[PDB]
C-alpha cells in the first residue's frame, strides 16, 4: 500500500518517503533528509531524552542530536555526547 | 551635523581662488611649434599668457575607446604628486595621426577611426568626437587653472577654526572644466547623502570629495562623507560618458546646465591627470573604467550572508548567547561581529583579557556552529610604551610625521594615538605581517576584519581629520596624499587575510574610506546613518553611486546607527537591507539591543521571512558578484543602465534592479499600504516572485503590501538559481541542491548563470576549480550547459526541482544526460498562475543536461 501525508495532502509510493524531495506538504515524507522547509528529524538519543530538530539541521555538518545521527552524510563525525 | 566643524568652499582657500574664476577667454594656448607626436602619446607645450608659465599637455588616444590628458609644469621647482597604486596597468595606448593642420588647429584620429581629437591652440581647447559627433569639450569656458609652484589671503599660512596649516609650498591648485553637449544626467562622485542624479551646485556649494568622519550626517547636501571616487557618468538616450580625475587631494565638483552639462574639476595638489571614457554604452563605460582600476574582489560566500553587529558585544558570553540566538528562533547568520571594546583599551591586535579571556575558544565554537567573527582593527596606535604595535612602528620609523620630524600624536578612541603612514609600501607590509596567526594571538581562520577611521579620523583634528601639513613617504605632504589613505588600509588589511592562509584563502575586509580601486580589496558600508525612514530610503541611490562607480559591495547599517528604530522600520530595514549587496546590522554604544528575536513574533517572522529570502538567492548574488569580479559590472544597478532608452527611469532612486533578473521596490515609509512600482521594458514581463502573478511593461503598478512583503519581480527572459533548502549560515548550504526559476518571455524564451566554486579560496583563479553555467529555455527545452569550459569542479550539488512561469500545462516531462537512459519526470501545474513545478531532475550541476516539455 502507498505511503498518504499525515496531513492528508497526497498519497505517494513509499519510494518518495526519505528520497531527499518533499512531497507532503506537512514534510512527513521526509523524515530522515533535510527535504521539507516543515520537516523534523527525531533524535532517537538512546539512554536519554528524544528530542526533534529542524529537517534544515540534518547533515548541516553542526552536531545536534546528543547521540550525532543527524549528521549521517555531511562530513562531521559527532560523538556521542548524551551521558 | 554641525556643519561649522567642515570647510564650505569659500573656507577652502584653493577652492575660493579655483571657483571665483568666472567663465571666459581662456590665457592658456598651445605653442604648436613645440608639438611632438609618438605612436603612444601627443606632447605640446602650453603657456599662460600673462604668468608665461609653460605647462606640457601629454594627450593619448587609449584602447576601448578612452583619452587621456596629463598637464604638469614643464620646469617645476619641485616633482607634482602622480596617483600611485590605483591603476591596475599600463593603459595600452591607441596611436594618434594628424589628420588636419592649420596655423590654430590640429585635427588627430585615433588609431583607424572612427574616433577624432580636435587641439585647439588659442584659446586652448580639446574637442573629443566619434565621426561628426561631438561628445566632449575640455576647457569649453576657459576655467583652466593651474597654480605654478612659487618660491591673496591664506594662499600660505592658513588656519580653519584653531588649526593652523603652514603650507610650505603655497598656492599649487589644479583645475579643468568639461562639456558634455547632449547630457542632462550625471551620476557618481560618492560619497555623498544625496540623489542618484546629481544636482546642479550654480547656485550653491560644489559637490566635496574630501574622506572625512562626519558625526550625525544629514541627508540630500554635498558635504563630503567618508570616502571619494572621482569619476562621474553622463547619460543620455543615445550616448554614455565617463570621467575618470586620477587625482587623491581635496577636490570640488562643480555641475551645472544650459541641452548639456558641465563639469568643472578643483584639485588641491598633484597634477591634472583625467581619463575621458567614450562609451559608447554604459556596459563599454564599465568595462573601460575596470580595465583602468580593476574589479570587484570576488567575495567569499560567507560575506554575503547575514551579518549581526553592534558597539558592542559585552563579552564571550554574550556572543554566544547571540548566536545561540539565531538559532533557537531559527534565524540564518554567518557572522557576529566585535567591535572597538572587544580590545584591550582600544590597542588593536589585542583582546580584553575579562571579556574575551580565551579568543581562541570563542572562535571554535563558532566555527561548531560553521560561522565567521569579524573584528575591528583601526589605523590608529595607542601611544603607550607597554604596547607592542607602538613601540614596533616608532622604532622602525613607520608613524606619519610632522613637519619637525617628530611622529603626529593626535586623539582618537585609545585618547593619545600615532597613524601609521599607510603609503609606505614597508608600512603596508608590516600590517599585512601583522595579520599572521603568530602575530595576532588569539585569530583564527574564521576570523575576518572591519577598518574603520581610516579617513583619517583624528578627533582633534581639522575637520576631524589629519593636518594639511602632515609629511608622508618620500616627502609628500598629507594634502598631496588624502583621498588613498584608507584605501591603503583596506588594501594592506585584505593583503594580510590572505597571507596568513599562504596566499590561500579569499580576504573579507569591510572599509569605512575609500578612492577609485577600492573595490579590489573587499566591502564598503555608508558609515554612521540614523534610525529614521529617510536614512532607510537613501540607502538605495548612495549604494548606486558606488556601484555605478565600481564599488558594487555595499551596504547601510540595517535598522540605523545612531537611535532606535521603531520595530516596523527595523523590519522594513531588514527587507531592504536582504536585497542589497553588504548586509549587516549595526548599532551605537547608546541604542537598546536589536537582536531580531526581542521583537514581537508578527516583526520576528517578517524579519527571518527577509532572511530566508537572502540566503535563497545566494547562488544568484553569488553568480553576480563573479561576473562583477569578471567583467565590472554593477551587482545593484539603477533601472536606466537595464533600461537606457527609458528617460522616465533616468532620476529612479526608490526601486533597483539586480543583475537584469530581479527588480527590487522595498516598501519604505511607515504605514504604507502600497507601493507605486515602476516595471519598464516595451514587450518586456515581469513576474511577482510570491503570487507569479505576470505584468507587462511599460506600467506603473500600485502593488498592496503587508508588514512581511518586499515588492520584487523577476523579468521575463531570465533564469535565477536559488538554495530552497534554507540552512542557519551559508557554509551549511554550500553543497546543496539548486532549484531553478524560469521566468518565460513573451517569446516562451529565458536564460541565466550560475558560478559555483568552494565558497572561499583563489582556487577558482589558480587551479580553475569552479563551475560557469549557462541555463537556456526556448522551444520547449530548458538546456545546461558550459559557459566556461575551463572550469572543472567535484561537487555533490544537484537540480532538485525547476519553476517555470508563464507556462501551459505539458503531457509529458522528458530529460536527457550524458551516461544516463532517458528519464519521466514528474510535474505539477497551477492554471490559474501557469507555473509548472518539475520534481526532482536529479541531474549534477556540473553535467550537461536538457529536459522537454511535450
Ligand atoms: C568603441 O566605440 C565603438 C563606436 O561607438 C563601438 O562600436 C559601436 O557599437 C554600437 C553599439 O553600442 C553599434 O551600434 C549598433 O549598430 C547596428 C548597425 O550596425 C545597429 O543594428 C544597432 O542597433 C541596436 O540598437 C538600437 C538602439 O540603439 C535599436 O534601435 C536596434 O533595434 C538595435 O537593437 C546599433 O545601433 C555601432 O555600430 C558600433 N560602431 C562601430 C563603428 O563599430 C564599440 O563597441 C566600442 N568598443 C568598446 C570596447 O567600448
Ligand atoms: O567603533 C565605534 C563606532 O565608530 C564609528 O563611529 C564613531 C561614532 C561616533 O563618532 C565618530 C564621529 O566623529 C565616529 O567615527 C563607526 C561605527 O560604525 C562604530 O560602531
Ligand atoms: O522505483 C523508482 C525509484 O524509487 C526510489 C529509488 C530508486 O531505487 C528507484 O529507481
Ligand atoms: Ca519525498
Ligand atoms: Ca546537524
Known amino acids: 500500500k502507498p505511503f498518504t501525508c499525515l496531513d492528508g495532502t497526497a498519497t505517494i509510493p513509499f519510494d518518495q518517503v526519505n528520497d531527499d524531495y518533499c512531497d507532503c506538504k506537512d514534510g512527513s515524507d521526509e523524515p530522515g533528509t533535510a527535504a521539507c522547509p516543515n520537516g523534523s528529524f527525531h533524535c532517537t538519543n538512546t539512554g536519554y531524552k528524544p528530542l526533534y530538530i529542524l529537517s534544515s539541521r540534518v547533515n548541516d555538518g553542526v552536531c545536534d542530536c546528543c547521540d550525532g545521527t543527524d549528521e549521517y552524510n555531511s562530513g562531521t563525525v559527532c560523538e556521542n555526547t548524551c551521558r | ?854
Open chain 2, 1 to 854: 551635523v554641525d556643519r561649522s566643524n567642515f570647510k564650505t568652499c569659500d573656507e577652502s582657500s584653493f577652492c575660493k581662488r579655483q571657483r571665483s574664476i568666472r567663465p571666459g577667454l581662456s590665457p592658456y594656448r598651445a605653442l604648436l611649434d613645440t608639438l611632438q607626436l609618438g605612436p603612444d602619446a601627443l606632447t605640446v607645450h602650453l603657456i599662460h599668457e600673462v604668468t608665461k608659465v609653460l605647462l606640457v599637455l601629454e594627450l593619448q588616444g587609449l584602447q576601448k575607446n578612452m583619452t587621456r590628458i596629463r598637464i604638469d609644469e614643464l620646469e617645476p621647482r619641485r616633482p607634482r604628486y602622480r596617483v600611485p597604486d590605483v591603476l591596475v596597468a599600463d593603459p595600452p595606448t591607441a596611436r594618434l595621426s594628424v589628420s588636419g593642420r592649420d596655423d590654430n588647429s590640429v585635427e588627430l584620429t585615433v588609431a583607424e577611426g572612427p574616433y577624432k581629437i580636435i587641439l585647439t591652440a588659442q584659446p586652448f581647447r580639446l574637442d573629443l568626437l566619434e565621426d561628426r559627433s561631438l561628445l566632449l569639450s575640455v576647457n569649453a569656458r576657459g576655467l583652466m587653472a593651474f597654480e605654478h609652484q612659487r618660491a591673496e589671503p591664506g594662499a600660505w599660512e592658513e588656519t580653519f577654526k584653531t588649526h593652523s596649516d603652514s603650507k610650505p609650498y603655497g598656492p599649487t591648485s589644479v583645475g579643468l572644466d568639461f562639456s558634455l553637449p547632449g547630457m542632462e544626467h550625471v551620476y557618481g562622485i560618492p560619497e555623498h547623502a544625496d540623489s542618484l542624479r546629481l544636482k546642479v551646485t550654480e547656485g550653491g556649494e560644489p559637490y566635496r570629495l574630501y574622506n572625512l568622519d562626519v558625526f550625525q550626517y544629514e541627508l540630500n547636501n554635498p558635504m563630503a562623507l567618508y570616502g571619494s571616487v572621482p569619476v562621474l557618468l553622463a547619460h543620455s538616450f543615445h550616448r554614455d560618458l565617463g570621467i575618470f580625475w586620477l587625482n587623491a587631494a581635496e577636490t570640488w565638483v562643480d555641475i551645472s546646465s544650459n541641452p548639456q552639462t558641465d563639469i568643472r574639476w578643483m584639485s588641491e595638489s598633484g597634477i591634472i591627470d583625467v581619463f575621458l571614457m567614450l562609451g559608447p554604452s554604459v556596459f563599454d563605460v564599465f568595462r573601460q573604467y575596470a580595465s583602468l582600476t580593476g574589479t570587484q574582489a570576488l567575495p567569499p560566500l560567507f560575506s554575503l550572508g547575514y551579518h549581526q553587529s553592534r558597539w558592542n558585544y559585552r563579552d564571550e558570553a554574550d556572543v554566544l548567547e547571540v548566536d545561540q540566538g539565531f538559532d533557537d528562533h531559527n534565524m540564518p547568520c554567518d557572522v557576529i561581529w566585535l567591535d572597538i571594546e572587544h580590545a584591550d583599551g582600544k590597542r588593536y591586535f589585542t583582546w580584553d583579557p575579562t571579556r574575551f579571556p580565551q579568543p581562541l575558544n570563542m572562535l571554535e565554537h563558532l566555527a561548531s556552529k560553521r560561522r565567521k567573527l569579524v573584528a575591528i582593527v583601526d589605523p590608529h596606535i595607542k601611544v603607550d610604551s607597554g604596547y607592542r604595535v607602538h613601540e614596533e612602528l616608532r622604532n622602525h620609523g613607520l608613524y606619519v610625521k610632522t613637519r619637525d620630524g617628530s611622529d603626529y600624536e593626535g586623539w582618537c578612541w585609545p585618547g593619545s594615538a600615532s597613524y601609521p603612514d599607510f603609503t609606505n609600501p614597508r608600512m603596508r607590509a608590516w600590517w599585512s605581517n601583522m595579520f599572521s596567526f603568530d602575530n595576532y594571538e588569539g585569530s583564527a581562520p574564521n576570523l575576518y576584519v572591519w577598518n574603520d577611521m581610516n579617513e583619517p579620523s583624528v578627533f582633534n583634528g581639522p575637520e576631524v581629520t589629519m593636518l594639511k601639513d602632515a609629511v608622508h613617504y618620500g616627502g609628500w605632504e598629507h594634502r598631496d596624499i588624502h583621498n588613498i589613505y584608507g584605501l591603503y588600509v583596506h588594501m594592506a588589511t585584505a593583503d594580510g587575510l590572505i597571507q596568513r592562509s599562504g596566499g590561500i584563502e579569499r580576504p573579507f575586509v569591510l572599509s569605512r574610506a575609500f578612492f577609485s580601486g577600492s573595490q579590489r580589496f573587499g566591502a564598503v558600508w555608508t558609515g554612521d546613518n540614523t534610525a529614521e525612514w529617510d536614512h532607510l530610503k537613501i540607502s538605495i541611490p548612495m549604494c548606486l553611486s558606488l556601484a555605478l562607480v565600481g564599488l558594487s559591495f555595499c551596504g547601510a547599517d540595517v535598522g540605523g546607527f545612531f537611535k532606535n528604530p521603531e520595530p516596523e522600520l527595523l523590519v522594513r530595514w531588514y527587507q531592504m537591507g536582504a536585497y542589497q549587496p553588504f548586509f549587516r546590522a549595526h548599532a551605537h554604544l547608546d541604542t537598546g539591543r536589536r537582536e531580531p528575536w526581542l521583537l514581537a513574533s508578527q516583526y520576528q517572522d517578517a524579519i527571518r521571512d527577509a532572511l530566508f529570502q537572502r540566503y535563497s538567492l545566494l547562488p544568484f548574488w553569488y553568480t553576480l558578484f563573479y561576473q562583477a569580479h569578471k567583467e565590472g559590472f554593477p551587482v545593484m544597478r539603477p533601472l536606466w543602465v537595464q533600461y537606457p532608452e527609458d528617460m522616465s527611469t533616468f532620476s529612479i532612486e526608490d526601486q533597483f534592479m539586480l543583475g537584469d533578473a530581479l527588480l527590487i521596490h522595498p516598501v519604505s515609509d511607515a504605514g504604507a499600504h502600497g507601493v507605486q512600482v515602476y516595471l519598464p521594458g516595451q514587450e518586456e514581463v515581469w513576474y511577482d516572485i510570491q503570487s507569479y502573478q505576470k505584468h507587462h511593461g511599460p506600467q506603473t503598478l500600485y502593488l498592496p503590501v503587508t508588514l512581511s512583503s518586499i515588492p520584487v519581480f523577476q523579468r521575463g527572459g531570465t533564469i535565477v538559481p536559488r538554495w530552497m533548502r534554507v540552512r542557519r549560515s551559508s557554509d551549511c548550504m554550500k553543497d546543496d541542491p539548486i532549484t531553478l526559476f524560469v521566468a518565460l518571455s513573451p517569446q516562451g524564451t529565458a536564460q541565466g548563470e550560475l558560478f559555483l566554486d568552494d565558497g572561499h579560496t583563489f582556487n577558482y583563479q589558480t587551479r580553475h576549480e569552479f563551475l560557469l553555467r549557462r541555463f537556456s529555455f526556448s522551444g520547449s527545452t530548458l538546456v545546461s550547459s558550459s559557459a566556461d569550459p575551463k572550469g572543472h569542479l567535484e561537487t555533490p550539488i544537484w537540480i532538485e526541482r525547476v519553476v517555470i512561469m508563464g507556462a501551459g500545462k505539458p503531457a509529458a516531462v522528458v530529460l536527457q544526460t550524458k551516461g544516463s537512459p532517458e528519464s519521466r519526470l514528474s510535474f505539477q501545474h497551477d492554471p490559474e498562475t501557469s507555473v509548472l513545478i518539475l520534481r526532482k531532475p536529479g541531474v549534477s550541476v556540473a553535467s550537461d543536461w536538457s529536459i522537454h516539455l511535450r
